[PDB]
C-alpha cells in the first residue's frame, strides 16, 4: 500500500523556521494535505492541496511538493505551533493515507518558575482508612523537574505516583505528584513536604497533621 514517511521529531525555537518533510514515491504527482494536532486536542487542517491555507492559518506556515518530497515549513515559530503534524494524500488504490506524524517542540521560550500547591489528606478520605497528600506543580518552563517527598526531612521511597511533566493549553508544563500513606503514618510525623527543583531552584511546601 502507498507509504508516506515523516521524521519522528523536529525542534524549532521561538521566531525561527523549521521544515517537516513528507516523503512518498512520486508524491509530487499527488495533492498533499496537512493536519496539526495540539496536545489533548483533535487534529485541525492547516494546509491543503500542497500549499493552500484554510481559514485562520497565518502566512508564516507554508507548504510545497515536488518529486518524492512534500514539506511543511513553520516560520516565525510561536508557542502554539507545538504538537504533532501529519501529512496525508488520497491514492486511487490505497485511498486516504497518513504519514506517521512529526512531533514539533517549540524551544527557546522564557523560563517560568513553578507554582506549587500541597494539599493534606481530606477528612472524607481519612474516613475510608487511607491518607493521600497531593502536590500540584503548574505554570513551569522548561519541563525538567525533580519532585521529592519528605517525611520530617527524611526522603520517602514508597507510595509516590508522579505524573510525567506534560504541556498544558497555556504552553507551560504541569505535573502532579501524589503520596500514599497509612493513617497511622500520617499521624506519626510532625510534618510532610513536597520539594520541587526546577532549573537549579528549589521550592518546598509543607503540611502538618496538627493544623487539620
Amino acid at each position: 500500500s502507498y507509504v508516506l514517511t515523516q521524521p519522528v521529531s523536529v525542534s524549532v525555537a521561538l521566531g525561527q523556521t523549521a521544515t517537516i518533510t513528507c516523503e512518498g514515491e512520486q508524491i509530487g504527482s499527488k495533492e498533499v494535505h496537512w493536519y496539526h494536532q495540539r496536545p489533548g486536542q483533535a487534529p485541525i487542517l492547516v494546509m491543503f492541496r500542497d500549499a493552500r491555507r484554510p481559514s485562520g492559518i497565518p502566512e508564516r506556515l507554508s507548504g510545497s511538493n515536488s518529486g518524492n518530497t512534500a514539506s511543511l515549513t513553520i516560520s516565525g515559530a510561536e508557542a502554539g505551533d507545538e504538537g504533532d503534524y501529519y501529512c496525508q494524500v488520497w491514492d486511487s488504490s490505497s485511498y486516504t493515507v497518513f504519514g506517521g506524524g512529526t512531533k514539533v517542540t517549540v524551544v527557546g521560550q522564557p523560563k517560568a518558575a513553578p507554582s506549587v500547591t500541597l494539599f493534606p489528606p481530606s477528612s472524607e478520605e481519612l474516613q475510608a482508612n487511607k491518607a493521600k497528600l497531593v502536590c500540584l506543580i503548574s505554570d513551569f518552563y522548561p519541563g525538567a523537574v525533580t519532585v521529592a517527598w519528605k517525611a520530617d526531612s527524611s526522603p520517602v521511597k514508597a507510595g509516590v505516583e508522579t505524573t510525567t511533566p506534560s504541556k498544558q493549553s497555556n504552553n507551560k508544563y504541569a505535573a502532579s505528584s501524589y503520596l500514599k500513606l497509612t493513617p497511622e503514618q500520617w499521624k506519626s510525623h510532625r510534618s510532610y513536604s513536597c520539594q520541587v527543583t526546577h532549573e537549579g531552584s528549589t521550592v518546598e511546601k509543607t503540611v502538618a497533621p496538627t493544623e487539620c
Binding site: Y35, A42, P43, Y95, S122, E124, V134, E161, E211
Partner: protein, 214 residues
C-alpha cells in the same frame, strides 16, 4: 457553525461491538462525505473508511472491512461507525471527520470518542475536596481511582473557568487512574461564593458534584 458532536466514551469487552455516533449540524449533511479516523494512545492517525451520505456506499480501509459497518441516518444528519469483534488493539480515540465537498482532505474533525477494549471492570471515581488546613488561595478536588479514561471536570456548573486548572491523570499499577483539578481564587470570596467541582465519568455513567468550600 459546522459541528460534529460525538457520543460518549465507553469501555467494551473483547469480542463485543461498539457503535459511535457523529451528529452533524451547521451545513447540508448530504453535501459531504464523512470519514472515520482513529488514534491509539500515543500513536498516529489511522484512516478507517469514508461514507457517501447520499447513497450510504462506503470505501473501507481493507484491514477493517470485515468488522466495520459505517452508516448514516439522513433523517437525523448522523453518521455511525460500528466496530465489532473488538480487540485490545482497538483501544483508541475514534474521530468522525468531514471530507471536503468534491475534495479529498478532511476539513472539520469531531472531538473524538475514546473506546477502551478490555476485560477490566469499570470503576467510577471517588471525589474528595482538596483544601489547605490553616495573595491567592487554592481549592480543588481529587478524582480518585477510576477506570477507564476519560473524565471531565468543571467548576460551578461551567460558570467558573478563570483560575481553573484540571491536571492530567496518573495511572497506578493497580490499573486505576486519578486526577486533580484546582481553582486559584482571591481569598476575599471565601464564605460568599460557593465552590463545587462537577465530575463526569461517561464509561461508568458516574456524575458527582462535590462542594469544596462554603
Amino acid at each position: 457553525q459546522v459541528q460534529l458532536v460525538q457520543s460518549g466514551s465507553e469501555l467494551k469487552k473483547p469480542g463485543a461491538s461498539v457503535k459511535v455516533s457523529c451528529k452533524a449540524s451547521g451545513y447540508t449533511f448530504t453535501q459531504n462525505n464523512m470519514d472515520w479516523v482513529r488514534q491509539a494512545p500515543g500513536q498516529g492517525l489511522e484512516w478507517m473508511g469514508d461514507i457517501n451520505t447520499r447513497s450510504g456506499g462506503v470505501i473501507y480501509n481493507e484491514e477493517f472491512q470485515d468488522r466495520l459497518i459505517m452508516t448514516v441516518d439522513k433523517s437525523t444528519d448522523t453518521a455511525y461507525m460500528e466496530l465489532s469483534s473488538l480487540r485490545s488493539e482497538d483501544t483508541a480515540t475514534y474521530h468522525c471527520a468531514r471530507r471536503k465537498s468534491y475534495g479529498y482532505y478532511l476539513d472539520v474533525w469531531g472531538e473524538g470518542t475514546l473506546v477502551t477494549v478490555s476485560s477490566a471492570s469499570t470503576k467510577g471515581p471517588s471525589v474528595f475536596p482538596l483544601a489547605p488546613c490553616s495573595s491567592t488561595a487554592a481549592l480543588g478536588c481529587l478524582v480518585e481511582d477510576y477506570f477507564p479514561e476519560p473524565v471531565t471536570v468543571s467548576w460551578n456548573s461551567g460558570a467558573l473557568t478563570s483560575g481553573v486548572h484540571t491536571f492530567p491523570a496518573v495511572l497506578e499499577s493497580s490499573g486505576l487512574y486519578s486526577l486533580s483539578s484546582v481553582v486559584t481564587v482571591p481569598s476575599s470570596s471565601l464564605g460568599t461564593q460557593t465552590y463545587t467541582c462537577n465530575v463526569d465519568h461517561k464509561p461508568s455513567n458516574t456524575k458527582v458534584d462535590k462542594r469544596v468550600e462554603s
